[PDB]
Structure formats: C-alpha cells, structure tokens
C-alpha cells in the first residue's frame, strides 16, 4: 500500500518563532514523557456529553492545538541533515533516547546553550532518521498522529472526514463484527478502536477498515440525517434525540419499518466545516484519529493541489495533483438542512424543527460570543507578553461566521447511496 511517509512543520501568519511555552508541556508532562498525550486527551472529553474546560485549555480544540504547537517545537532537534539526539535545548527541552524518546529539562550546560532555531512550513520526510527507520512499527505508530497534526495544519480551516461508501463492506465477518455493538454509543466503540490500533494498527485491507468505514459513514449520514427510521442503510442508524445542543450521543438502531437500497457505485468525499465552534464536538477528532490509521495501513487517495494553499501543494504523502475539493459547512445551517429534509420526508411536524432551531442557534450565539471574548483576552495577553507567546487555539477570523456553501453539497453528499 504505502511505504512513503512524510509530514510538515507548521507555519505562522506572523510569528517569528514557536509560540510554545514550557508551562504547556509541564502541565501535560506532569506525568510521563510521551510526545502524544492520547490517553487523557481522549479522556479529557468528559464523556463528550459535555466538555472539559480550563483557563489553560478550555477545549480539546485548545488541547490538541497546543499539542500541535508543542510537538512542532519538539521535532526541531533530532531531525536535520545532521540528525542527532541529546544536549541541545529547545526551551530546556531534552529527549532521552536514540529512538528519540523521553522528555526532561536540559542539563545544566544545556540549560545555558541557545535553543535550536525554527523555520516555517518545514515539510520533511518521515523516513530519514535511521533509528526508527529500523523499526517499522513505532514508525507507523507515530505516523497516525503526525497525520492528525498535518491534515488540520494543511488548511487555514478545520478537520475533514474522508467519507467513503463501497459495497464489499458487506461481508459475513463484517456484519458479524457489526453485531458486537448494538445499542452502542459511537464514542465508546471509537475508544475500542483507539485501543485496537494503538496496540497494533490493523493491516491494509483489514476487516476493521470496512468497519470504521461503516461507522463514520453511518455517522455522517445521521449527521446530515441522510438515513433514518424509514430511510435505512441495511436497516441501521444512530440516534440522539437531544438535538439542538452542543452534545450528541448517536447510537446504533435497527428499523423494521422501511429499508432503503444501496445501488451499485462506489463513492467518497472530503468534508470540513466552516464554523470554528467544533471545539465542543469530539467526533471530528476521533474521525481524524481513525483516518490516520486508515492512511498508515492503507495507501489512500490524494486531493488536488488547487484544493490546498499553493505553498502546501504537490506533497507526495498528502498532496496529489487531483482529488475532490473539500466540503465545508456550518453546524447552524447543517442542522437546518438536516431537520428540514427530514421533515420533507414527513416524519415530523413543523414546530418540531422550529423548537430545534431556537435552542440551537441560541447556543450558537452564546458560544460564539464566548469565543470572541477569549480571543480579546488572549490579544491583551500578547500585548502584555513580549516573550511568553502563545495562541490557545488556531487564530481565527469573524470572516468565518457565514455561509456554509453547503447548498448543492446537500444533494451531493446525499447522492452517495
């Protein structure tokens, strides 16, 4: 499938250096030395029915964002034409391994030394350094999160699911494996998968590939509300009736009422949003998490160069010369279209969708306001902070509070049955 492995190092819209401050690492390295903080990252969700929030990190938006800033700073050292490990600070940072592991304070001499400079947009290959280049396995392991960084990094905007629908995803072992999780919350099986590859990413055309395909696909179908109690996908569909809020629990169900048919014809596409409120959502992060493994086990298609910023084009590992341009939206009009075509089916009443929209856009308002306020606070911080710099999250613009451009995309992603 894929024997080529690369990545890139983040750029900035105006910062002369890394904005990472040791404080972040510390409050994360309070335990251990890992470069990936997967465990409490995932557990920091507070079950996702609500979020975990702090001044240091109010959202896993912020969490993973600084995770990224950190690891961007981290990689600086060992990875050069002059590859190496040990005794050169990156804000007192030192690894302790030839496999480039362990993270502690610089030695006294190394505390005095100047830190390694950084550069922006520093794309590289993940196969140059020899040590890990001897162990395929830990290499793959790290790659599934190098990707999680990279993909979100490649765009001035958010994450993307590479949704794919294909028939062979029906098989005996398949529906077998399916059977394991009836009446099950998406999030928990996501956890199981994080496990079942963190141990070992399954092999290229693994059973579990087709599975997670089913998972994310049915997820997004319910997400748009594509399938439902009557429009059913081999009679399976998640639920979360509490719609209108920032937390959903979509769960497997079988409908013995009507079933919708899958015509032949394999299809797929690449979805992002256009509202930077996703910081309440998690499902995007897990989809990212798994799609990373999908890459690290299976060589996957690429997108058009024009689909991405010019400086970030023609990437062997990610940026091919063709591939379906992204698909953006905003959750507000997302649930709008969702409930609307649902009632189009006549399984509702009008006041239903209406009372949905009320609370939904109420929440939209409030939390956008909170977002912008925290932005102001961080600005004043920077003003007070000539030397201890940071961005809680990927900096944004109000220009990102409008059209989802999702209109025809509705029918597009809808015609994937």
């Amino acid at each position: 499938a894929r024997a080529a492995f690369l990545f890139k190092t983040v750029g900035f819209g105006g910062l002369q250096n890394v904005p990472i401050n040791d404080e972040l690492s510390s409050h994360l390295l309070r335990a251990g030395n890992s470069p990936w903080q997967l465990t409490q990252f995932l557990d920091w969700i507070s079950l996702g029915r609500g979020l975990a929030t702090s001044a240091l990190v109010p959202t896993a938006g912020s969490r993973y964002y600084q995770m990224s800033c950190l690891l961007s700073g981290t990689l600086q050292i060992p990875f050069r034409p002059n590859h190496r490990w040990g005794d050169i600070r990156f804000l007192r940072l030192v690894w302790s391994a030839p496999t480039l592991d362990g993270l502690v304070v610089a030695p006294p001499q190394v505390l005095a030394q100047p830190a390694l400079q950084a550069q922006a947009d520093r794309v590289y290959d993940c196969d140059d350094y020899p040590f890990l280049a001897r162990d395929p396995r830990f290499k793959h392991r790290v790659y599934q999160q190098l990707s999680a960084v990279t993909l979100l990094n490649l765009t001035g905007f958010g994450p993307i699911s590479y949704v794919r629908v294909d028939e062979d995803m029906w098989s005996g072992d398949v529906n077998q494996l399916l059977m394991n999780y009836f009446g099950h919350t998406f999030a928990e099986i996501a956890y199981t998968l994080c496990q079942a590859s963190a141990n070992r990413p399954w092999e290229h055309d693994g059973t579990y590939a087709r599975m997670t395909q089913i998972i994310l696909s049915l997820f997004w179908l319910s997400y748009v509300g594509v399938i439902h109690q009557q429009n059913t996908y081999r009679t399976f569909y998640f639920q979360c009736n509490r719609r209108g809020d920032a937390a959903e629990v979509w769960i497997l169900s079988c409908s013995l009422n009507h079933s919708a048919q899958i015509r032949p014809g394999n299809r797929s596409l690449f979805v992002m949003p256009t509202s930077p409120d996703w910081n309440m959502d998690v499902n995007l992060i897990l989809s990212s998490t798994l799609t990373g493994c999908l890459c690290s086990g299976s060589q996957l298609p690429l997108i058009d160069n024009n689909s991405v910023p010019a400086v970030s084009r023609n990437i062997h590992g990610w940026t091919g010369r063709a591939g379906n341009q992204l698909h953006g939206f905003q959750v507000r009009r997302m649930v709008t279209e969702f409930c609307d075509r649902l009632r189009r089916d006549g399984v509702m009443t009008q006041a239903q969708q209406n009372q949905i929209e009320a609370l939904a856009d109420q929440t939209q308002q409030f939390k956008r306001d909170k977002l912008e306020a925290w932005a102001r606070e961080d600005d004043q911080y920077n003003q007070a902070n000539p030397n201890s710099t940071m961005f809680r999250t990927k900096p944004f613009t109000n220009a990102q509070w409008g059209r989802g451009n999702t209109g025809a995309t509705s029918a597009a992603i809808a015609a994937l049955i």
Binding site: P136, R137, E203
Partner: protein
C-alpha cells in the same frame, strides 16, 4: 583508486547486454533426464597443481540434495560415480514413463523445484511415488505448492501461503580433496544444511511477516 588495502580501476568496464531466459517443458524434463553423452549437465572441476577432478558444480535442475551425505552412496572414482548415476537415471526414466507416457504429450510446464525434490527423494533412496501429479504445472506452482499442508516436511515446509526450503545443492567436493593452494572453495554450498530461503510470490505481505522473524 586505492581503498583500504585494495587497488582497482579508475575507469569502467561494465557492459549492458543481457538475454532472455529458458522456459521449462516436458521434453525439457526428459532430455535433462537423458544426461546427453557429451552434453552432460555438470562441470567436474579439479585442483590446479596437476588438475585432478576433485569436485563438481551443478547446473540446476539436478539439485535438491537436502540431507546427510551418509545416505547418498557413491564411489571415490569419477567414472564409477558417473556410471552408477547413468544406471539409476535410466531406471527412473523407465519409471516416469510408467507414470506419464512419452507421447502422453509433447511439452508442458512442471515445477522445477518439485523436480528437484524428486531428485533428492530418489537419490536419498526414499520413496516419492506419491507426489506425482503434483509435478504438472497447471498455471502457477505457487498455489500448487501451497495447496498442501503436511507431507515430506524434510524437503520443504509450508507456513501459510509460504514455502520455506533450502535451495537445491550446487557444489560437491569429492574424495581426493587436499586443501591445496590450488583448491578453490565451494563456500559450503555442498552442505546438508547451510542456508534457508523462503517464497510466496510477493514482497509486501512477508515484509509484514518479518516483524515475527529473525
């Protein structure tokens, strides 16, 4: 050019020219089992003092020698070895005839590696009159050699879609050897165990497999 102790070219002599390979068929098998007077498929080499034949290197397919010499049996005289050879050969000739008629067909593919397993079984003086249709290559010996699960685990052994063997023998030292200044070494390719190689048909899956192999 003088590397650490060696002094070599400073300009090339490397050609580019190559040819095409042989394909194997029935009368291929036959003639190879004919040991053509004058076109015999071996090269009996010698020392280099008085140049006395003391070894041979083989032209596969005649290989498949996998076990201890102490079961082989053959004289210390060159000619004697060859006549005993010719005898047993024409015997197994009559045999393979019994199995397949000379006119049953004309020419057709057969797994050479299989033929060499037969070589070894015969010379080993052990029975093989049970692995017989397995000779005939229908389309791809890979699936053919891999269809079976347990038989004669002493030539070949299958693990998954893999077959694992040591390739047929190439050299043989004879009974006049004396470790002379004129004795070029075969490098232990005549041993009853000096190597192991492994096939299915493809790189990647075994490249996977090796995380669980030395």
């Amino acid at each position: 050019a003088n590397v650490w102790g060696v002094r070599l070219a400073d300009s090339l002599s490397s050609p580019t020219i190559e040819t095409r390979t042989r394909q194997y068929t029935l009368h291929d098998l036959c003639s190879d089992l004919d040991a053509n007077p004058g076109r015999e498929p071996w090269k009996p080499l010698r020392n280099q003092r008085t140049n006395n034949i003391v070894a041979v290197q083989l032209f596969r397919p005649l290989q498949g020698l996998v076990l201890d010499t102490q079961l082989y049996g053959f004289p210390g005289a060159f000619d004697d070895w060859e006549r005993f050879m010719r005898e047993k050969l024409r015997v197994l000739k009559y045999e393979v005839l019994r199995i397949y008629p000379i006119s049953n067909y004309s020419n057709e593919h057969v797994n050479v590696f299989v033929a060499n397993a037969l070589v070894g079984a015969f010379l080993s003086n052990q029975a093989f009159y049970d692995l017989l249709p397995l000779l005939i290559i229908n389309d791809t010996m890979i699936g053919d050699l891999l269809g079976t699960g347990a038989s004669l685990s002493q030539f070949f052994q299958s693990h998954g879609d893999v077959l694992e063997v040591a390739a047929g023998r190439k050299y043989l030292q004879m009974e006049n050897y004396s470790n002379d200044d004129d004795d070029p070494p075969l490098f232990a390719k005549d041993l009853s165990d000096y190597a192991k190689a492994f096939y299915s048909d493809t790189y990647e899956v075994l490249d996977r497999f090796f995380w669980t192999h030395d």
